[PDB]
Design a protein around this ligand. Structure first.
Ligand code: O21
Length: 288
């Protein structure tokens, strides 16, 4: 861990990083808030990923892989960008953009009606920005595999930023019954070919994006509440599709249903979703 080669254009001297509050423990790393001086005399709030106290040699390898993948993908306004690393004279820190308004599920839930209310235009605009993020990632051949409002973060200026996109495919033993911190099952966002045949593509991320649209328009609603894994598989095998949320146009509902085509080749692309959402935003009212 203290024997890592430097990548000089990314390297930040450790003493320029003021560590702050821990956000607790992830799968192979952990995240702490911090402030970074420079990136000259200016502080930027950042989030930092580092190793757990009890950390395997594979954890270290995974943390490095995620960093290097972030470098290869490059920057975009609608993703959480790599800003820096500390690789020398101490523990590995991977330093990213900090999004101050939490994840999109929380952002949306906090702005449900009885401060800050979201207009219909604001909701379509979150969708647009996520789609744009995902279009960028798709153009870099990055398949997300867990696209969901939980993995979108919102900046101080209400920008949407896709998170957690730099993970290499797990040599798949994915545990279907594992829940999120908030008690929900990630299997509920997965395309059926992903769930049943373990095939993940841009097309399967477009299915996940449809569930994300439904989350946006339910203001952080929970898909399939109270449905366990076995019953979810049966709903999918039957061709069940979630109901149209209230306060969602027929057009946005058709976009969801199109994202949820049984035939992956027949779903829209993110390129097509970006275009449609661009047109829809312009036509959607900000008056309520
Ligand atoms: C900028 C102000 C601020 O304090 N923001 C803030 C406070 C509290 C909670 C979240 C945030 N915003 C934020 C967080 C992150 N994280 C942490 C997201 C929440 N954790 C998920 C993991 N769980 C184990 C703890 C809770 C984040 O992980 N960022 C992140 C890192 Cl560190 C990363 O390292 C390589 C790679 C990615 O994505 C590729 C991300 Cl998203 N990030 C930004 N703002």
């Amino acid at each position: 861990e203290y024997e890592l080669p430097e990548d000089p254009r990314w390297e930040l001297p450790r003493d320029r990083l003021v560590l702050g509050k821990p956000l607790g423990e992830g799968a192979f790393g952990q995240v702490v808030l911090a402030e970074a001086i420079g990136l000259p005399n200016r502080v930027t709030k950042v989030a930092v990923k580092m190793l757990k106290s009890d950390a395997t040699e594979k954890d270290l390898s995974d943390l490095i892989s995620e960093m290097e993948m972030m470098k290869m993908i490059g920057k975009h306004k609608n993703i959480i960008n790599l800003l820096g690393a500390c690789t020398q004279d101490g523990p590995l820190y991977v330093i990213v953009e900090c999004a101050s308004k939490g994840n999109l599920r929380e952002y949306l839930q906090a702005r449900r009606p009885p401060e800050e209310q979201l207009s219909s235009k604001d909701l379509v605009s979150c969708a647009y920005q996520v789609a744009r993020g995902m279009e960028y990632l798709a153009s870099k051949k990055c398949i997300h595999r867990d696209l969901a409002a939980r993995n979108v973060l919102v900046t101080e200026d209400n920008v949407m930023k896709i998170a957690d996109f730099g993970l290499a495919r797990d040599i798949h033993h994915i545990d279907y019954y594992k829940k999120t911190t908030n008690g929900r099952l990630p299997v509920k966002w997965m395309a059926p070919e992903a769930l049943f045949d373990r095939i993940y593509t841009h097309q399967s991320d477009v299915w996940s994006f449809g569930v994300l649209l439904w989350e946006i328009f339910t203001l952080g609603g929970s898909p399939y509440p109270g449905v366990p894994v076995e019953e979810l598989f049966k709903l999918l095998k039957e061709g069940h599709r979630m109901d149209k949320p209230s306060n969602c146009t027929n057009e946005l509902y058709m976009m969801m249903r199109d994202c949820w085509h049984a035939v992956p080749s027949q779903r829209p692309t993110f390129k097509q979703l970006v275009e449609d959402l661009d047109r829809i935003v312009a036509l959607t009212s900000n008056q309520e």
